[PDB]
């Protein structure tokens, strides 16, 4: 059944530039293909539908053309409020693309990481929980590994990210290890390794058992 | 006006039902092919179902037959969607939606879903509501590093969402990044709310996090306090 894709996954853009995003569909669609603005806590928004028609008040810099198996949307000046994520739909199926994202483009900045021990609070409930931070930083591609002891690469962590600041226009990470009471007092160096690409070589944050 | 609200929404185990209303006002109902797609969190959007004006021609997510049936009652003007054997991929917002399905060449065709309504929440889970345990992440890296000094609080082990976070009764905004709560490897929800301060001023400072779980009806306020390194 139609299966939609859209390239790109994310776009960064500064207020001016004409962006456009494409939406194609396995099948022919012919102009049964449609758009939706959304920022997050807000409900979608039709900006075109029938390929071109825009709808009653969406601001003439949005476009839109296609012809069957490739759709395009394309905005000409970005003023700061378009920043979103645009999902194009098509209507022999009803099934939506996966989406784009928009976010404001700005220099790298490199990010700082923080790392937090467990407390002893919650080690007397059994468990433990290391945090990193990386804290400020562009591109939002920057990736975190922990190590414990010499090198035990570890694979069950849960990082999650904020949005985009609205002053300065960064993000930031955290990366949370759990490890019960016990496993947590049977190692000793505990590593967050952050590498972004504004950095020239991986920053590793560490600490060791009891000592701190 | 013209609007669509829902109702239903809320907690339900896995493998158990729910059926969802959404009621409708301020167009001639009859007319309108109604639809409902849902919004799963930090996911997009999945188009769920759809009925025709005069229910003749009905649809269904290859994700959910079997299991959801829309009907649509015109006298009363509302859509409803009977759901079943709830696993947890059907954990989202829906939404119910309107079709500009005013149009005809070969065929009559819903053009666009232009009237949206703005949410349920259905979250399928079988924990129990818990209040967060709340644990301090020290004021330090280095004592200070990288300059203005990291601290936070760590709000543990809590159901359902959400739970508010704020420093210093509500007047300390500024550093303070409060990341999206993560639903954990069987169960409960965990978030960090964390402020740089200059390093300068902490050990003149109180830094105290609020942290409200309401569907436990929690109120902690944990004073951070750093340990020494």
């Known amino acids: 059944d139609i299966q939609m894709t859209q390239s790109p996954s994310t776009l960064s853009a500064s207020v001016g530039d004409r962006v456009t995003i494409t939406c194609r569909a396995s099948?022919?669609?012919?102009?049964?293909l449609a758009w939706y603005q959304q920022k997050p806590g807000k409900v979608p928004k039709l900006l075109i539908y029938?390929?071109?028609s825009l709808e009653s008040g969406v601001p003439s810099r949005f476009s839109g053309s296609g012809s069957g198996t490739e759709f395009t949307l394309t905005i000409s000046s970005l003023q700061p409020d378009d920043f979103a994520t645009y999902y194009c739909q098509q209507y022999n199926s009803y099934s939506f693309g996966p989406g784009t994202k928009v976010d404001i483009k700005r220099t790298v900045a490199a990010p700082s990481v923080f790392i937090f021990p467990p407390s002893d609070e919650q080690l007397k409930s059994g468990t433990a929980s290391v945090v990193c931070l990386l804290n400020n930083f562009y591109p939002r591609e920057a990736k975190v590994q922990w190590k414990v002891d010499n090198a035990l690469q570890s694979g069950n962590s849960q990082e999650s990210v904020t949005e985009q600041d609205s002053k300065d226009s960064t993000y930031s990470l955290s990366s949370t290890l759990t490890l019960s009471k016990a496993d947590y007092e049977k190692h000793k160096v505990y590593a967050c390794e952050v590498t972004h690409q504004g950095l020239s070589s991986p920053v590793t944050k560490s600490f060791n058992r009891g000592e701190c | 006006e013209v609007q669509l609200v829902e109702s239903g929404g809320g907690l339900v185990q896995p493998g158990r039902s729910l059926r969802l209303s959404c009621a409708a006002s301020?167009?001639?109902?009859?007319?309108?092919?109604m639809h409902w797609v849902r919004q799963a969190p930090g996911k997009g959007l999945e188009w769920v179902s759809g009925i025709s004006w005069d229910s003749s021609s009905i649809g269904y997510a290859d994700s959910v037959k079997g299991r959801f049936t829309i009907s649509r009652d015109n006298a009363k003007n509302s859509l409803y969607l009977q759901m079943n054997s709830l696993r947890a991929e059907d954990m989202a917002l829906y939404y119910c939606?309107?079709?500009?399905?005013?149009?005809?060449?070969?065929?009559?065709?819903?053009?666009?879903?232009?009237?949206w309504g703005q949410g349920t929440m259905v979250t399928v889970s079988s924990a129990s509501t818990k209040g967060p345990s709340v644990f301090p992440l020290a004021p330090s890296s280095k004592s200070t590093s990288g300059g203005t000094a990291a601290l936070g609080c760590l709000v543990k082990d809590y159901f359902p969402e959400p739970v508010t976070v704020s420093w210093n009764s509500g007047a300390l905004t500024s550093g303070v990044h409060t990341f999206p709560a993560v639903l954990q490897s069987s169960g409960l929800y965990s978030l960090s709310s964390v402020v740089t301060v200059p390093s300068s001023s902490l050990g003149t400072q109180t830094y105290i996090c609020n942290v409200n779980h309401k569907p436990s009806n929690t109120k902690v306020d944990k004073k951070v306090e750093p340990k020494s390194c």
């Open positions: 939606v309107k079709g500009r399905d005013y149009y005809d060449s070969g065929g009559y065709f819903t053009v666009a879903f232009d009237i």
């Open positions: 099948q022919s669609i012919s102009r049964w």
């Open positions: 029938k390929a071109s």
């Open positions: 301020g167009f001639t109902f009859n007319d309108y092919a």
